[PDB]
C-alpha cells in the first residue's frame, strides 16, 4: 500500500546480506585459501548480525505497519539485540576454546593451557556484561563505582606485570647487549642467552641459569 | 569448620553489599555523597588487596611462563631448595636441610 | 557525500533514509584513515629496517 516505499532499501541489503552469507560460508567449506584466523569468523558474525538489524528490524517496521497484532515495538527491539548478543558468546566462545586446543597441541601442559582458558573466559565475561550492563539487567551509579574500584585494583595489582612489559621492549628497542654479550646485570655476570618479553635469561660462568625480570634490569 | 565458617561470613558481607548497590536506589535512598563514601570504602578495598592480587598475578605468570616445574632445584631470592607444588599465591618448596619454606608469588616474580 | 545528503533532503521520494547515508559517509572516511594511516607505519618500518636495525 503505502510501506513497501520504504522498505525497498531495508530489502536491498537484506537480499545482498542473504546472498553474502552464503559466499563466505561456502568458502569455507570449499578449502580455505586465506589465512582462517578470527578475522573471518568476525566477519560472519558482522555479517549475520546486519539481518538480525536488517530483518529483525526489518520485522520492527513491519509492525510499525501493522499495529493491529499486540505485539510491543519495546519487547522485539529487547530480543532483536538480546538474540545477537547470544551469538556473540556462542560464537566468542568457540575460537578461545579452539585456541585451547591449538595451545595443548603445540605441547603446553594441560594445566598450563587450562589455567590460559579459564583467564580469557573470566575476562571475556566481564566485557560483555560491560557492553549489555544497561539493556541486560541494569547498571547503577554505585555498581559503575564498584566496578570502576575493581578495575582500579586490577591495574595497581599489574604493575609489575605492565613494567616488565614496558622494560622488556625498551631494551628490544634500546641495545644494551644482545645475546651471547657478556653483562653484569646488577650484581649478576653471565651470557646473555634471550631477552624476552617479561625477562632474559643469562648462563653464568659457573653454568647455571638466571632469568631476571625485564623491570628490575632497565 | 572455623576455616569454611569464615569463608561464608566474607560471602554474606560482599553478597549484601552488592545488594544494596543494586536496590540503592529502589530500596531506600542512593545520594551522591553516598556514592562518594561507597567509592571511597571499594578504593581502600582495593588498596588492601594490593597483595592479594599481585600474588595472584605472580601466580598466573610463573604458570604460564615455566623458570621452574615441581621437583627442579631452585634459588629464589636467598632460598635454594626442591620445588614441591605452584599455586595462585604462593609456591612451596623443600630446603635440602629437609624444612618447607612457603613463598609469596610477588616476592618470587 | 553530504552533497548528496542534501540532495535526497531535496528528492524525499527516494526511500533512502538520512541516517544511514550519515552513517555510511562518515564510516567510509573512517576506512580510507585506517587504509591511509597503516601505510605510513609500514613504510617507516621499511625505512627502519634499511637503516640497519634488527
Ligand atoms: C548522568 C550520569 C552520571 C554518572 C555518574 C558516574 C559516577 C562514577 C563515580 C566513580 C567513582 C570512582
Ligand atoms: C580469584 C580472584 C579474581 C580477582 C578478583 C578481583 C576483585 C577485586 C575487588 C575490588 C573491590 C574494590
Ligand atoms: C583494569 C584493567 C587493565 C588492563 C590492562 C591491559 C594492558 C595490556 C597490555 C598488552 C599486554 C600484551
Ligand atoms: C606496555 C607498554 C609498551 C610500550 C612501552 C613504551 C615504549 C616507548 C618507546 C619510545 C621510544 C622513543
Ligand atoms: C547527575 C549525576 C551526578 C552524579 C555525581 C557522582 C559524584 C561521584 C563523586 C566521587 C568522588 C570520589
Ligand atoms: C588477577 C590477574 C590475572 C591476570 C594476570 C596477567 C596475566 C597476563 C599474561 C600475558 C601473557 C602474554
Same mark, same amino acid.
Request: aromatic share 10%; with cysteine.
Given at each position: 500500500?503505502? =510501506? ?11 537480499? #545482498? ?5 552464503? =559466499? ?31 530483518? #529483525? ?14 505485539? @510491543?515495538? #519495546?519487547?522485539? *527491539? ?10 556473540? @558468546? ?93 653483562? *653484569? =646485570? %646488577? #650484581?649478576?655476570? %653471565?651470557?646473555? =642467552? ?5 625477562? @632474559?635469561?643469562?648462563? @653464568?660462568? *659457573? ?12
Amino acid at each position: 500500500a503505502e =510501506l513497501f516505499t520504504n522498505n525497498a532499501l531495508n530489502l536491498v541489503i537484506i537480499f #545482498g546480506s542473504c546472498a553474502a552469507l552464503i =559466499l563466505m560460508s561456502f568458502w569455507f567449506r570449499r578449502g580455505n585459501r586465506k589465512r582462517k584466523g578470527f578475522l573471518f569468523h568476525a566477519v560472519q558474525f558482522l555479517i549475520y548480525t546486519i539481518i538480525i538489524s536488517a530483518v #529483525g528490524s526489518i520485522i520492527n517496521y513491519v509492525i510499525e505497519n501493522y499495529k493491529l497484532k499486540f505485539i @510491543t515495538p #519495546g519487547v522485539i *527491539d529487547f530480543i532483536c539485540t538480546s538474540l545477537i548478543a547470544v551469538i556473540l @558468546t556462542i560464537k566468542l566462545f568457540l575460537l578461545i576454546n579452539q585456541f585451547e586446543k591449538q595451545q595443548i597441541k603445540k605441547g603446553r601442559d594441560i594445566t598450563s593451557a587450562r589455567i590460559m582458558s579459564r583467564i580469557i573466559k573470566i575476562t571475556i565475561i566481564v566485557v560483555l556484561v560491560l557492553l549489555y550492563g544497561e539493556h541486560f539487567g541494569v547498571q547503577t551509579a554505585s555498581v559503575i563505582a564498584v566496578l570502576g574500584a575493581a578495575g582500579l585494583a586490577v591495574g595497581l595489582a599489574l604493575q609489575g606485570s605492565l613494567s616488565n612489559l614496558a622494560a622488556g621492549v625498551l631494551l628490544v628497542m634500546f641495545r644494551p647487549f644482545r645475546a651471547g654479550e657478556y653483562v *653484569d =646485570l %646488577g #650484581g649478576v655476570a %653471565g651470557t646473555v =642467552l634471550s631477552v624476552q618479553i617479561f625477562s @632474559t635469561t643469562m648462563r @653464568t660462568a *659457573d653454568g647455571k641459569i638466571i632469568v631476571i625480570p625485564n623491570g628490575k634490569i632497565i
